[PDB]
């Protein structure tokens, strides 16, 4: 089969099913800054720091000292690399004020560095004539045994792969960056067009950049802090589980993440929320008001709240953000306040990504995840979700209004629990200065799940 | 790594995150009347009267005079820096230039400069490449940090005109001014920035003081009265200082009589209440008014309260969002109301509408200003939804009024749904409207199906 | 009459109802990556080891030693069919291209000829003399060509497809963020086609209503159930098990695998919503063991996420797991994650897909599907791909008495008489236990009943 060597770029050599075709090229292609010099770059700088292979980075725009200024940022220290015989960029930029020379050039650096990786950066820039040119180019380069990646550019997101129609099928391997624009949001994404004799995965696949390019179960229970709440779950939640709390404006969900948070606290566990409709403030004083003390939790280092704007960002920022944040604070319980806030206004594809991708690390860290959905209808609601997220999820506490003697009644209901029992009652709650106090089922009453039930 | 120098330009340094790539050149792209001329003249405004930094502005097609007259309409006194030699307008206008520019920078010991705009010279795409390499390396190499202007004849088409020039830049800029139905919308992106951060995709600006780009909210236990005695016990007290108020129902349920009602009790407390009023004149809001005993005329000319009476097909959400913003600065109210955000939704994008009430809702919060907003719902009955906007999670409080059919008349009912923070009154409360304003009077403990609006006696 | 010499290409003689027209050229474009290459070489490769009919391949860019190695990662070993003088690849990387073409073919004794690519007003006289000499020569020619767009122009120039008397589109197309492979045959002179697109993979090279049908009998694992079914499943049908989130529609699947594997049977499970840890955890709770039956070679799980790969990739999948595995027994768990996001066409080829290879492999198959609506449904599938399965197990919840109760009906089931019951369940620790009708409500079905 065609060997294949390790980039290392977060993700990559998963998509790619082990990395780039060894002793080829590979075209990166795509729009002004999605990426290209810096894939270009990580490429070299993983190949000398993880595998000692020596690498000739061409530039034929960019100074060789803004090349290394840039790189700074990352914590990549190119000089260094330099100093020690592993680096060379080769300047073959214009003057301030052909061809077959500059492949000898190339060579001259390749057998004096004995170098195994080559980047080009971009060849589109020193440009039929262009066909016959990247395969004299592409030729060397194959003779000699190095793994090249040449980045070319593009006008559109969804058009041509290059920028003369020709680049793509002269290269064995082509990688398309696309940055595109939903709505006034930009989404990044990777694609692998073409491997010639290989396998790699199709379309595109979402990614940040942020330190480079980045593209088990337990029978153990867990109290909500509602004492009623723990005996209707079959004796509490499950530590690897997402929990959902879903139903109308007003009904108690804030509440009830409220009670989880606190709870994990007060057994000396960290607890992390994410919070996109309240302040802080706001936050502390509706809890004080329950009876939960946010602030005392705070000082002793063991509740941290990250409020944020859902359109502030993109779902995949605000997906490594929270990876970031349980990466460095290392909680036990994780809150979102809601997923409905987050999918507000993004296409339900993208959204149900992000909650995938929530869930997913959640469940390998194994994090007690708690995350609230707001309704559209208030009542008569025939779905748990508008977003269909429900299979996702492994318990759904629905919460309900009731008109009953001419009152807004609310009921709770543990609607779905995964791996356990529990109690089918639609039980009337109230809310009080001691937060959720849970009672009965309404015996007889017909029609309770309508909003509007007629008495037997 | 890569250090930025302030531009001071409202709301830039947040999405920069610091302001501009020192000693490097950025592109500012986009049609005719972006802001892209004042983007340029605004750096170097900035550059000179806030951090002392001398500026070269070059100009290939408007006169240094008309950039001068063109600025005294922000109160920028561009003539007094030039007579200082802290400006240098370069006329590079028709009847090599980077000789000229750099004798300017040496002579003015100039950090700063704007060049509008680039495309004016710009014939090969080969040919316009190797240029702005040619002028973007020479202003490299002086130190200074450079803007240059693009033109683009597309909203969503190339980045600059050649397909090229985006590629040479370390920085790129886009200005848009976007056609949405019949309505401009004006916004920025940073689309790169070489070696460092950026936030990313478009963000919403208007043109006021130059150009200005635009959840940390204080939260108190106090008490305000709705100047209605029942809703004030229903609400466990009355609203809560620090709130948002939606009062959502159908056509003629009474929201115009209850915002009539917030206004009037802070002006008896010596307070400025605020009206921005999208449906009806000052003239009806003032004789409907009267019907209670509110007089408007008398709180208007005693400088108590302010009523602001537009139609929202007149300007853009954005430009809405500025004329409440200015407002509530000159006239510092206490209590704001917007009679209807359902006035405001009409023809517009869900996406924009959410955009504005975040806008309007979250800078009220802010200032700890009470305001008060009605929504009207489609559906006069029957309906399972609070507003078809949703905007229910980001209000506080949500009063419900409601048609009822009683033995064949229409009864009206009101309900709190919803009051963060406190307790509140569970009850569908029957209210009947007369002089005395709203009466709110029992719950029908006799009905089922209330809040269908045909109840079921039992 | 135009008579066709056979590909062997797996599904292309169906779809071009032969092969290739004998003595002619046979246009085969697409964009980049759309599988030319490999078409051109599996012409030759197949016309040599099945048919003995000598090779010719003309390359203008890539060198003989990649054509040669990129082979190899299906097992075609080029290099011993050129070493019999049964292959020869010329390297050309026009009179006088023409003249080694003829030689290298008279040489050769070849019967078949590939042109890649022949990209790399003037064109149309190009590839007519081209074209026009190799019919004189009695050789079967394929030609690749290049696109920019999907959709756009058949070739690059316009002229391309009006000379060639055989044209082929390869597609690779952007349904959202999902690429789906796609074969056309535009046109065949003189002679009939089948019409517009048909999926393919690339897998062993390129890879583009007739089933038996008995009255065996097979568990469902739940007795009251198979009573109800009127002594069980069919062996040879889809069942469709129907319902909101929470039902139990997974304890169902977890059955029907375990009585197949305590039988000695085989059994194979797509898994689209849950790990093996949390599929393993939950089916331990009623005294099942995966990872046991998977230790004995009884059970198989397949874990993937809908959105990793395209249906056409995920039948693909399937398909082979099928091949390798040889079950009786095979559940989709579940359909409603494939259908998220893609559109209704394209999930309903996939579906007649699978349930087509379980009907001809006489393979049980038991598939899940969540329905939006948790209450008051007036639909057994949002999908409405009823029509495709043979037996159908509603799951819905019931309001009795303030509580969520919940009921099982046999909706439909072809073949066979079953209960009318809308039957109450309770999932305890034995499972399933079905017990009576609520013979004393109406509208048990809306969810929300009255007493009578
Ligand atoms: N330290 C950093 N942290 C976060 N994002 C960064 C950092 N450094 C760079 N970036 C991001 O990477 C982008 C630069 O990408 P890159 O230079 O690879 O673009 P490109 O594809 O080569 O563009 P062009 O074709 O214009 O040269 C910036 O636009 C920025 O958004
Ligand atoms: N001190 C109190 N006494 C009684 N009830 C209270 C008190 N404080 C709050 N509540 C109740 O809690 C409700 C708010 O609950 P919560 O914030 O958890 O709702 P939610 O479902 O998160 O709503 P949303 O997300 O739409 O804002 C109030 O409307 C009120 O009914
Ligand atoms: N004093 C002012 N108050 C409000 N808006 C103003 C004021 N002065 C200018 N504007 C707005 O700014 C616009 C001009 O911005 P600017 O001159 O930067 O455009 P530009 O992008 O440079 O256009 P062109 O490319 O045609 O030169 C005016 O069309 C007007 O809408
Ligand atoms: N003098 C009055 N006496 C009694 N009821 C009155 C009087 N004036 C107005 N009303 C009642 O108040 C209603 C108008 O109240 P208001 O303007 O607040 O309604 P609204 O919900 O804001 O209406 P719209 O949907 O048209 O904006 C009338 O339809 C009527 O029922
Ligand atoms: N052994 C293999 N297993 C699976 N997929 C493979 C294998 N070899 C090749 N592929 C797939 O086939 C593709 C190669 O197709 P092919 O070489 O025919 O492209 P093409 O249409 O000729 O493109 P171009 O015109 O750019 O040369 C790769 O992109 C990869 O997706
Ligand atoms: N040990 C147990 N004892 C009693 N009931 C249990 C037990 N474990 C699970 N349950 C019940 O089984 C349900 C889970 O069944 P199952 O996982 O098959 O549902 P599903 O229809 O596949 O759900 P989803 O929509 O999440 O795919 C729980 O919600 C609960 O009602
Ligand atoms: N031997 C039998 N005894 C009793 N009922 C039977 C028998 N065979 C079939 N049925 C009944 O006939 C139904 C199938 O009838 P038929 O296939 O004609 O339905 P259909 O409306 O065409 O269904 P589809 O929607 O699948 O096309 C079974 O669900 C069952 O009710
Ligand atoms: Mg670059
Ligand atoms: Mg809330
Ligand atoms: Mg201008
Ligand atoms: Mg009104
Ligand atoms: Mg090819
Ligand atoms: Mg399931």
């Given at each position: 089969e065609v060997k294949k060597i390790p980039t290392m770029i977060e993700g990559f050599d998963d998509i790619s099913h082990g990395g780039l075709p060894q002793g080829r090229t590979t075209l990166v292609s795509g729009t002004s800054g999605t990426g290209k010099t810096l894939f270009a770059v990580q490429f070299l700088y993983n190949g000398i720091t993880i595998f000692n292979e020596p690498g000739i980075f061409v530039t034929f725009e960019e100074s060789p000292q803004d090349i290394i200024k840039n790189a700074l940022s990352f914590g990549w220290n190119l000089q260094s690399l330099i100093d020690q015989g592993k680096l060379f960029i080769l300047d073959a930029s214009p003057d301030p004020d052909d061809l077959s020379a500059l492949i000898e050039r190339i060579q001259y650096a390749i057998r004096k560095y004995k170098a195994t990786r080559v980047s080009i950066d971009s060849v589109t820039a020193v440009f039929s004539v262009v066909r016959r040119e990247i395969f004299r180019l592409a030729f060397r380069l194959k003779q000699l045994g190095v793994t090249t990646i040449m980045t070319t550019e593009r006008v559109d997101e969804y058009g041509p792969v290059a920028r003369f129609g020709v680049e793509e099928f002269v290269s064995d391997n082509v990688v398309i960056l696309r940055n595109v624009l939903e709505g006034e949001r930009r989404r990044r994404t990777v694609e692998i067009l073409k491997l010639r004799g290989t396998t790699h995965m199709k379309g595109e696949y979402p990614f940040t950049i942020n330190n480079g390019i980045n593209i088990r179960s337990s029978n153990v229970r867990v109290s909500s802090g509602v004492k009623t709440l723990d005996e209707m779950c079959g004796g509490g939640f499950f530590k690897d589980s997402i929990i959902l709390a879903t139903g109308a404006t007003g009904t108690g969900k804030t509440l009830l993440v409220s009670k989880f948070l606190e709870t994990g606290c007060q057994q000396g566990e960290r607890a992390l929320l994410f919070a996109y409709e309240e302040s802080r403030a706001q936050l502390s004083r509706n809890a004080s008001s329950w009876g939960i003390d946010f602030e005392e939790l705070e000082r002793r280092g063991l509740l941290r709240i990250i409020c944020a704007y859902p359109e502030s960002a993109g779902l995949e920022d605000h997906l490594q953000i929270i990876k970031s944040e349980i990466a460095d604070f290392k909680p036990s319980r994780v809150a979102i306040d809601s997923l409905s806030a987050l999918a507000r206004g993004v296409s339900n594809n993208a959204f149900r990504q992000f909650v995938i991708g929530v869930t997913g690390f959640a469940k390998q860290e194994e994090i007690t995840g708690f995350f609230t959905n707001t309704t559209d209808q208030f009542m008569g609601s025939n779905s748990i979700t508008e977003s269909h997220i429900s299979t996702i999820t492994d318990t759904i506490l629905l919460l309900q209004y009731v008109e009953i003697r001419g009152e807004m009644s609310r009921a709770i209901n543990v609607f779905k629990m995964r791996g356990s029992w529990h109690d089918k009652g639609i039980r009337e709650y109230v809310i009080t200065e001691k937060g959720a106090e849970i009672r009965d089922s309404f015996?007889?009453?017909?029609?309770?799940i309508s909003g509007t039930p007629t008495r037997i």
């Amino acid at each position: 089969e065609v060997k294949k060597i390790p980039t290392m770029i977060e993700g990559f050599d998963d998509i790619s099913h082990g990395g780039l075709p060894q002793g080829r090229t590979t075209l990166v292609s795509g729009t002004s800054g999605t990426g290209k010099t810096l894939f270009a770059v990580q490429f070299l700088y993983n190949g000398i720091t993880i595998f000692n292979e020596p690498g000739i980075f061409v530039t034929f725009e960019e100074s060789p000292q803004d090349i290394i200024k840039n790189a700074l940022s990352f914590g990549w220290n190119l000089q260094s690399l330099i100093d020690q015989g592993k680096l060379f960029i080769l300047d073959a930029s214009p003057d301030p004020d052909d061809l077959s020379a500059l492949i000898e050039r190339i060579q001259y650096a390749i057998r004096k560095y004995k170098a195994t990786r080559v980047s080009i950066d971009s060849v589109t820039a020193v440009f039929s004539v262009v066909r016959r040119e990247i395969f004299r180019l592409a030729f060397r380069l194959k003779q000699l045994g190095v793994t090249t990646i040449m980045t070319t550019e593009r006008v559109d997101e969804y058009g041509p792969v290059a920028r003369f129609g020709v680049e793509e099928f002269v290269s064995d391997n082509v990688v398309i960056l696309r940055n595109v624009l939903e709505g006034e949001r930009r989404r990044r994404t990777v694609e692998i067009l073409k491997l010639r004799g290989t396998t790699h995965m199709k379309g595109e696949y979402p990614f940040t950049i942020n330190n480079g390019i980045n593209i088990r179960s337990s029978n153990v229970r867990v109290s909500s802090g509602v004492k009623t709440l723990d005996e209707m779950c079959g004796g509490g939640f499950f530590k690897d589980s997402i929990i959902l709390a879903t139903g109308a404006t007003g009904t108690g969900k804030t509440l009830l993440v409220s009670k989880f948070l606190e709870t994990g606290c007060q057994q000396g566990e960290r607890a992390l929320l994410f919070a996109y409709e309240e302040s802080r403030a706001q936050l502390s004083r509706n809890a004080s008001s329950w009876g939960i003390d946010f602030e005392e939790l705070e000082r002793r280092g063991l509740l941290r709240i990250i409020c944020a704007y859902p359109e502030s960002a993109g779902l995949e920022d605000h997906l490594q953000i929270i990876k970031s944040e349980i990466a460095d604070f290392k909680p036990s319980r994780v809150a979102i306040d809601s997923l409905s806030a987050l999918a507000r206004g993004v296409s339900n594809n993208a959204f149900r990504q992000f909650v995938i991708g929530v869930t997913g690390f959640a469940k390998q860290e194994e994090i007690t995840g708690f995350f609230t959905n707001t309704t559209d209808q208030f009542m008569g609601s025939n779905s748990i979700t508008e977003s269909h997220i429900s299979t996702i999820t492994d318990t759904i506490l629905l919460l309900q209004y009731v008109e009953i003697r001419g009152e807004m009644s609310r009921a709770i209901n543990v609607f779905k629990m995964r791996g356990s029992w529990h109690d089918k009652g639609i039980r009337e709650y109230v809310i009080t200065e001691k937060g959720a106090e849970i009672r009965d089922s309404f015996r007889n009453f017909e029609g309770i799940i309508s909003g509007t039930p007629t008495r037997i």
